[PDB]
């Protein structure tokens, strides 16, 4: 049951990039569900204003990675992933923006990766609209916090 908090700082600049229709695609560092365990990372988009149905959305995907333990682990990957954008206000007035997905073992995304990062990710194109960001204190000190929680075994 691994937990990873991805600290995306200098966020105003990424936002200014998105506003100017310059793509923003970032990857979290790789993290392990355990030692031994699977290696995963997240991929985050700020969809461009010109991007058809998902313009101005944060996209958030989980990616499978080649890990030190891959030959000892069962494949394909199976579990429950919780993706959360953290509301950085004090606990009384706090509401995180969150989704829960089931890593279905039949997706290409959860087969054993054969390159450093599996290009097939799994997540939400329209995970959170950029304007929802301004509705609570999700950005604090120029930093967005993206938490990933993997329930596996």
């Amino acid at each position: 049951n691994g937990i990873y908090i991805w600290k995306i700082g200098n966020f105003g600049m990424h936002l200014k990039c998105q506003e100017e229709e310059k793509p923003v695609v970032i990857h979290s560092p790789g993290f392990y569900t355990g030692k031994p365990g699977y290696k995963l990372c997240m991929r985050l988009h700020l969809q461009l204003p010109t991007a058809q149905r998902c313009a101005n959305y944060i996209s958030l995907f989980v990616h499978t990675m080649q890990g030190e333990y891959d030959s000892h682990l069962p494949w394909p990957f199976q579990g429950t992933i919780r993706l959360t954008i953290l509301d950085q206000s004090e606990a009384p007035v706090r509401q995180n923006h969150e989704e829960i997905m089931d890593a279905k073992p039949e997706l290409l995304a959860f087969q054993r990766p054969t390159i450093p990062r599996n290009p097939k990710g799994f997540g939400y194109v329209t995970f959170m609209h950029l304007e929802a960001l301004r509705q609570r204190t999700f950005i604090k000190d120029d930093t967005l916090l993206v938490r990933c929680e993997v329930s596996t075994l």
Binding site: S59, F61, H63, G121, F122, G123
Partner: peptide
């Protein structure tokens, strides 16, 4: 009540 999706990062 929102479904996750497979997304190839190279279809950019």
């Amino acid at each position: 009540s929102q479904s996750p999706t497979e997304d190839d990062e190279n279809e950019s």
